[PDB]
Design a binder for these strands. Sequence first.
RNA 1: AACUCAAUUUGUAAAAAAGUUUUAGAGCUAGAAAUAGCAAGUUAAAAUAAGGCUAGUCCGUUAUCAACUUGAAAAAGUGGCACCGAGUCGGUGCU
DNA 2: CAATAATCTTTTTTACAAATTGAGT
DNA 3: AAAGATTATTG
Length: 1322
Amino acid sequence: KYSIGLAIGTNSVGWAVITDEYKVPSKKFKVLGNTDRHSIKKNLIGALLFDSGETAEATRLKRTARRRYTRRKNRICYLQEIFSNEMAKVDDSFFHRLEESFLVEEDKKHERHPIFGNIVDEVAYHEKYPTIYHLRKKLVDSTDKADLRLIYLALAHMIKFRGHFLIEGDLNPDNSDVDKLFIQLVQTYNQLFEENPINASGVDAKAILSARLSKSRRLENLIAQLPGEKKNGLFGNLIALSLGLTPNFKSNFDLAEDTKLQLSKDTYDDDLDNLLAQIGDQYADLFLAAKNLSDAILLSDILRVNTEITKAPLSASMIKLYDEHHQDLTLLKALVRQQLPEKYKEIFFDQSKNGYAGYIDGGASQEEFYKFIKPILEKMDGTEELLVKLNREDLLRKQRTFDNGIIPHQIHLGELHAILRRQEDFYPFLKDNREKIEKILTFRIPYYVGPLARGNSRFAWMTRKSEETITPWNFEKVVDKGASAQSFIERMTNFDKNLPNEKVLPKHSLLYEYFTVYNELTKVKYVTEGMRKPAFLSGDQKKAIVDLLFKTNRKVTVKQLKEDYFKKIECFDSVEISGVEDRFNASLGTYHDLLKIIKDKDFLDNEENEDILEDIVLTLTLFEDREMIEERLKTYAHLFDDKVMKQLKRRRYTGWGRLSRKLINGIRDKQSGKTILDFLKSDGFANRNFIQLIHDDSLTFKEDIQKAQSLHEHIANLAGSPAIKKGILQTVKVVDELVKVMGRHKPENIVIEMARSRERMKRIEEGIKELGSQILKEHPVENTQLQNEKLYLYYLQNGRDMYVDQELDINRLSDYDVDAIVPQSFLKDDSIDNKVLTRSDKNRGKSDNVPSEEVVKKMKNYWRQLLNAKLITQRKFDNLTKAERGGLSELDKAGFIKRQLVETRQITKHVAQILDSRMNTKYDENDKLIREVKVITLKSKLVSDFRKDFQFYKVREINNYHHAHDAYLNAVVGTALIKKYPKLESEFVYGKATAKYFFYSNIMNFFKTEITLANGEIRKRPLIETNGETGEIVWDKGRDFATVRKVLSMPQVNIVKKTEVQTGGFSKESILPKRNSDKLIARKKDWDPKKYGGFDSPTVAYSVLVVAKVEKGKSKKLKSVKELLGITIMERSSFEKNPIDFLEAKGYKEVKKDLIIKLPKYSLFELENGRKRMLASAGVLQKGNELALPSKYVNFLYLASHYEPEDNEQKQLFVEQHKHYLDEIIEQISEFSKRVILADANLDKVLSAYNKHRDKPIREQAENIIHLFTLTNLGAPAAFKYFDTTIDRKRYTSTKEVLDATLIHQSITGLYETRIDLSQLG
RNA sequence: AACUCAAUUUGUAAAAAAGUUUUAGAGCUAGAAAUAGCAAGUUAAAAUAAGGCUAGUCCGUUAUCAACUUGAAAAAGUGGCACCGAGUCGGUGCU
DNA sequence: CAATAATCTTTTTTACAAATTGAGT
DNA sequence: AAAGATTATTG
């Protein structure tokens, strides 16, 4: 009889077998292979280590981007096919030259100048048009005919890099003068309000509305110049619209619901129509003048510089940039010549430095260029004008930059359209394809249709209603964007868990809301004078109340139910009502929504149209796109008014319920033949409801529901990080093997335990603008300094105290406290959602509770402001303010300390279910579950407190045994807990308030000998703990603390690192320039890396043992070899397909095919003196040994480093009394290193660095001695520091030695082993 | 088990802007030559996992993997127990 | 051969679905 | 976002 302990983690799984005396058994295990060893002894304890499981994210981003690349390529193909025939008459090789532009002249089949084909013309082109934008501008303004070649380039440039689709609608090319168009908004507005004009005299519109400021502040700055206007008044909200904000016009015109408008959304034109249909079209001209301002404000926000008008402002601006670059460089060159000759070569030549040379030809970012040039600019005169251009980031600008991410596609569309309109008179095929070409640029596959696949994509869902090849032009006529738009969502939505083949209804299904109202009503009871008993509402009464009350009001009150049904219908002068207090919770909200819209109660109440209304709601919840909703609702265009349809297309429902239609109003009761909703409408006098009906043995629902319905598959479908899903799956396989080790005798118990800058800035950055604090202007910042908690708080708090209405000085953060909102004595939560930065932690109030009612009544206003800006969370806000809602009650405080010991977590309970269902599988007579194995769950607090309480301290850095020790202690503490308190199986096994406080507080006291409670008392419970009901002995504090002490010291713990084939990217992604080296990899088959460059450093999927011959010398005489060869990820399938041919294509002859050994990463070899090594690749090794340090040096290292009860004399006694343990440890390390590590040069450094610091304090030495275990740790060599002496790593940069050693094939527990001696091969 | 709100984690789709790499933007004067002085520099094309077959405006980096036997695969099957002891596991006895 | 040092693809937006946890009901 | 394998250059 035995029990298994398990410690489940991201990178590890620890396990242990124990018996009823808490002892770890041992066994001798068969050993297989070709050695003489046929048996070996091992302890049934151990751990399993493995690299983290990765999420699918990076994999997805890479695939998403591949599609993007493929589609940009086709955009050009489309455009090249159009020019094809007509381009052939001008240049039968032009497109061929563009393709071949990458190849070197040695490999070019056509002339080497791509555009024209000679050199005199080509050199002349770049002089007239130094940039592609010079050509774009010219092809916009000029009226002369143009070379067909030059038309293509500009057009393809706009199509290749087409800009974003974040703004909807057209842009007007004329709307460009912000000053002019602003006066026209004012003039338009004053035409409407002649009584209260706006005087825009002397208001610099272009200055304020086109400044490089936030659009919020630009609004504020504008309004500031208009005495009279409110920021949220009509003109303010119109300027808000113009500036790209999203204002709300409800107060403006006194209207019902919020009517927000944003010019950039797909809905503005519909949402403006709905507002004009509410205030009158006398405002039509007013909202147009704002739209025209939005266009001109957008431009100024796009261009770094302003240009005298052109139909090509984007290009014209970059010409102004290149032009500005040329004159400022011409200036700076001659400027450095005449003031700093000792630098000109470092600045304009040395690509290794961050001057202008590294700026252009080197790899210097614009920021690095400015960070280098800025001091040099200050040192010289005639400069001040250029440092302005520097700090505005307009100094020597390139045109293709990171900033261009904001150019919307419309801008590129305008130029493309203009060019087409100039040259279509000369070139007829341009005229006929003007819309075709325009569609290549604007067309965008909708996110809801997805990959345009044809049945060979696990990612695609789209349906085709034709079958021809989809193009940007036939898209709407070949793709059923609508059916696929519905698939898009139905793939991901859930099914009814009661009927797992049925889709769940929308959250706003009328059937659902009916179902809810009745399920609430059927349990309402009434009595009054003359009734023996309370009474349910009969069928006739409920139906009456739903028609009478719920189908006229959205919320039905208890007042109405008494007065409008009971009094007016039932004559009941008075009545008492139970089953609903205050008001009903359910509502027919969707019914009232549609009634307020289509305005036909007969059409709503007639059950004939039930399916129509439900399809309307489905459409409104199944879709988000404007166009998609309209196309699906026009099915009801012959049924509803046009004004009705228009307001229908705007309503939107979000949400999906958990029940299906067939469930609520579909399945019957055979017997009675009525549905669940039928039952809810009338159920005799019983008046059952939903929960009682699905569980009612009297009624056939229960039978039919459980009449519905792999392992790794079952684990992949859990919710949780893929890292934990990896550990979980190995956890199960470990159990599955331990049972085989124990003779297929299932255990008694299984104890499981599961381990628990850029983002910070924008949180701050967003928060400060909602409050408009100048606080950053006052106190500048940096993204990397924000991982100092105190500093990060100072900004989240806006530099003000959380508990007193004073502010905080930034310079005295070390004196300010960081206080737990809920005290750590209840729940540990050292995160920002539970901490504040205050001048004194005493100003919260009593330390034993949440912030004082006083403090809330003083600070709630500020806290609310802090939440409005999203600088605290709602979680944080509720905790800050709980005082005014009762504070932490004495029973609440009991829940927090209970939660410290009972695993709440769902994922962990899913783990318990899988094991419990894998073990317990036999059933009994009455069809109940026979529980042979009890699965216990615990939180890490139990064992980690157990360690500290009983001198079993864990030091992680020493080795990996601690994962295995944690699993052992978990089996111990877990089975013992169920031993002493079997009544606690409810909270720990799968299947007056101060009582619960002191109980879970003194949960583990029965381990201790003498208990000291803080109320002044000694209470020594006896030497043997034993159950009250049960007679079974539980815990002999004499034997069993030594039984534990002995296990934790066993020097043999099965440490296994999971062997894994490496997958993922072929190599480092960096594209390196041409060198002469066999290590470069071609980017394309015909692209010689010696000529074109390529990739580098490929990831080895697995190494393989090659025992063959290779031609040696010029005589081609074969020389036997036993090498290890690395099979690249990219190389893998070619090798796997025909290994022998693969190996011969590398120069291997007479390959012994039978001896080819696949050696994945971390494959284990043991050599002399028990020295073990692991494969890191075909020519790198890892350390394979664990250092079995004796426990007494561990606890000493733990205590001598943790120099921070009165029982600490009993702990600090031990360090100074045992200061000799240092020199013992250093050689415990040394004796080990000289045996297995073999890092002679670095071992000296350790000895010479320990000896030098022996004078230092006992604590400084203990800590730094813990660093040294890095030299001895299993795995890959790493650097480490002693004091401040850095010791670089000794790496094992050859694999030759392992080929004559012993390969150790390891079971998941390590207990089963196959040992192969590799010197027996060859 | 319900509801509301909010955060978190996971999974999918559609987009944009960079970065890199080869080529094209005739470098000129001197000097036999290396070397020197000058002039320029901002742009473009193309590739962006090699590639694959199923040929799509699709797919190609997640999950899963000791050994041996059997399987297309998923996966199944394969290894005696007690005591004493403990530097990575030894030793002793039993069928 | 061993020591030593250098390198490592990045940023941004829209749309949706699911658990899951934590605080209010 | 480091880890740690690959690459190259130097003792």
